[PDB]
Amino acid sequence: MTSRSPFESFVWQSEIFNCQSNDIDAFYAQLAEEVNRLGLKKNTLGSVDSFAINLYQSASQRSDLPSLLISSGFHGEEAAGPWGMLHFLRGLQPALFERVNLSLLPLVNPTGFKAGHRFNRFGENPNRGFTLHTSLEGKLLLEHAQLLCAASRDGILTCHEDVLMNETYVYSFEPTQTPGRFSLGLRDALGQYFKLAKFIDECPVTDGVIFNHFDTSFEAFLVRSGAKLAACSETPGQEDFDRRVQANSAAMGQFIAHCAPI
Numbered sequence: 001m002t003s004r005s006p007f008e009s010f011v012w013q014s015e016i017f018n019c020q021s022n023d024i025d026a027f028y029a030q031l032a033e034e035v036n037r038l039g040l041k042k043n044t045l046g047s048v049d050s051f052a053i054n055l056y057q058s059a060s061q062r063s064d065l066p067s068l069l070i071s072s073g074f075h076g077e078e079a080a081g082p083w084g085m086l087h088f089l090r091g092l093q094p095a096l097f098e099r100v101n102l103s104l105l106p107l108v109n110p111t112g113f114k115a116g117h118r119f120n121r122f123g124e125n126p127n128r129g130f131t132l133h134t135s136l137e138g139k140l141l142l143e144h145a146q147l148l149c150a151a152s153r154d155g156i157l158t159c160h161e162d163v164l165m166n167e168t169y170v171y172s173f174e175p176t177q178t179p180g181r182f183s184l185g186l187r188d189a190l191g192q193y194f195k196l197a198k199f200i201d202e203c204p205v206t207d208g209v210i211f212n213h214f215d216t217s218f219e220a221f222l223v224r225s226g227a228k229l230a231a232c233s234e235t236p237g238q239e240d241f242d243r244r245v246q247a248n249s250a251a252m253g254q255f256i257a258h259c260a261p262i
């Protein structure tokens with residue numbers, strides 16, 4: 001038993017974005033500018049409280065190119081993820097899409113994001129229950145399971161934060177005994193920004209990696225469903241917000257470098 005409430009709200013100022021971290025209208029406005037510029041096609045998977053839960057993809061998936069998914073914003077206190085993706089998108093040109101079918105799920109929990117807390121506004125954890133209790137958002141994602149499995153065949157990265165942490169770590173899944181270059185490259189990217197953590201649910205973190213720990217999360221679901229490689233980065237929430245934005249963007253850049261190399 002712990003005294004730290006999952007219902008607690010957390011908010012930061014961003015100098016990169018010149019707004020507060022829970023400024024969901026600004027988020028959607030900036031995101032839309034980037035997806036327009038990059039020629040990405042919006043697929044709305046659902047909506048709650050007037051906020052769309054969108055998947056963005058290339059106008060066409062090419063069979064010869066790897067298919068990668070990056071997701072974030074399952075937990076509303078973990079705001080560096082969705083803003084990290086926006087920072088990442090700002091850095092990209094359309095040429096990236098000639099070598100990879102990149103899919104983006106920037107913000108799964110907009111009601112939690114708006115209020116700066118982990119749950120949606122109905123008290124549910126959107127990153128639990130995937131096997132197929134799920135949250136409303138989880139159910140809407142599961143209505144598009146086949147589309148999401150297609151999108152993540154060659155790899156999935158989820159960008160989380162551990163709000164009370166000062167150190168960083170990564171969860172990883174590979175079809176091997178021991179972590180390889182995929183896992184260690186991600187760890188190293190995160191490690192440029194923060195000190196590595198040296199337990200999650202009785203499971204030890206070893207050299208900043210938690211390896212092949214299956215639970216009912218979206219990422220474990222996609223691995224059981226066939227994704228070749230998966231990771232969940234965890235930036236420390238007790239550190240500087242704009243540095244967390246930078247670190248998330250850097251994890252994403254490394255994921256793409258490993259999985260869709262030049």
Ligand code: NI
Binds near residue numbers: 074078160161
């Ligand atoms: Ni999280």
